[PDB]
Paper text:
In mammals, the E3 ligase [name] mediates the degradation of aberrant nascent polypeptides by targeting the C-terminal polyalanine degrons (polyAla/C-degrons). The E3 ligase [name] ([name]), also known as [name] ([name]), encompasses nine zinc binding sites throughout the full-length protein, with six in the N-terminal domain (NTD or CHY zinc finger), two in the central RING domain and one in the C-terminal domain (CTD). Here, we present the crystal structure of [name] bound to the polyAla/C-degron, which shows that the N-terminal domain and the RING domain of [name] form a narrow groove encapsulating the alanine residues of the polyAla/C-degron. Affinity measurements in vitro and global protein stability assays in cells further demonstrate that [name] recognizes a C-terminal A/S-X-A-A motif for substrate degradation.
To better understand the recognition mode of the Ala6/C-degron by [name], we determined the crystal structure of the [name] NTD + RING domains bound to the Ala6/C-degron by fusion of a linker and a six-Ala peptide at the C-terminus. As expected, the [name] NTD and RING coordinate eight zinc ions, whereby each zinc ion is coordinated by four Cys/His residues. Interestingly, the overall structure of NTD + RING forms a π-shaped conformation, with the polyAla tail inserted parallel to the bottom of the width axis. this binding pocket presents a linear and long (~30 Å) deep groove, with an open and a closed end. Specifically, the methyl groups of Ala-1, Ala-2, Ala-4, and Ala-5 each point toward a closed cavity inside the groove walls, while the methyl groups of Ala-3 and Ala-6 point toward the groove opening. Concretely, the free carboxyl group of Ala-1 is positioned to form two hydrogen bonds with the hydroxyl group of Tyr23 and one salt bridge with Arg41. The backbone amide group of Ala-1 forms a direct hydrogen bond with the backbone carbonyl group of Cys108 coordinating the fourth zinc. The Ala-2 is accommodated in a narrow pocket created by NTD and RING, where a backbone hydrogen bond is formed between the amide group of Ala-2 and the carbonyl oxygen of Ser155, and the side chain of Ile107 establishes a hydrophobic interaction with the methyl group of Ala-2. The backbone carbonyl and amide groups form two direct hydrogen bonds with the guanidine group of Arg109 and the backbone carbonyl group of Cys125, respectively. Structural superposition shows that the E2-binding site is located opposite to the Ala6/C-degron binding surface.
Residue numbers in the entry: 15 to 202
The structure:
Amino acid sequence: RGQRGCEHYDRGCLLKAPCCDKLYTCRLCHDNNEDHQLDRFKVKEVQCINCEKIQHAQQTCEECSTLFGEYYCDICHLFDKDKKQYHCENCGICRIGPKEDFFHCLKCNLCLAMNLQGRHKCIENVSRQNCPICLEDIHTSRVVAHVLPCGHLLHRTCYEEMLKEGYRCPLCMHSALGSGSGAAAAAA
Ligand code: NA
Ligand code: NA
Ligand code: NA
Ligand code: NA
Ligand code: NA
Ligand code: NA
Ligand code: NA
Ligand SMILES: [Zn+2]
Ligand SMILES: [Zn+2]
Ligand SMILES: [Zn+2]
Ligand SMILES: [Zn+2]
Ligand SMILES: [Zn+2]
Ligand SMILES: [Zn+2]
Ligand SMILES: [Zn+2]
Ligand SMILES: [Zn+2]
């Protein structure tokens, strides 16, 4: 671990971005360096870092057999060391597991810690929204979301910064004290 990959991932291959047909270590490396956003489900090809064989996406290299990722999901085309990831069909992406700690809430439409099942306030597709603090997406973020007792969602980082200046939901102004607050599963 820690020999091959980027700042985001420990992986043995590079993705061929079907948009600009460039080779980037991962979708974040691509998105940080391109006008547009990479569609991870559209990725068809990868290149072995070790032997530069460009090939269809798979867990090991067809020529030299280098291990591309300890965890490999052929839907998101994600490669990584073992972080107990699982791919959730309702989220549509890979989550940081383990899968048994989480359930997918249909209404809020993200994976939530088991202790919130039937024990939180649902807001329709609230996960598919921007964080009201930073106004960047919650659902696909690699930062754990925090369910406020009111059911609104904040990035854990944005939530903890907000506590230095206040203690109320940035949208509905309800206090963050109380029942129904907890953690969601991070994007892998
Ligand atoms: Na490398
Ligand atoms: Na990726
Ligand atoms: Na849906
Ligand atoms: Na999606
Ligand atoms: Na589930
Ligand atoms: Na953020
Ligand atoms: Na995590
Ligand atoms: Zn591109
Ligand atoms: Zn990267
Ligand atoms: Zn190879
Ligand atoms: Zn996946
Ligand atoms: Zn889910
Ligand atoms: Zn819910
Ligand atoms: Zn945020
Ligand atoms: Zn709120």
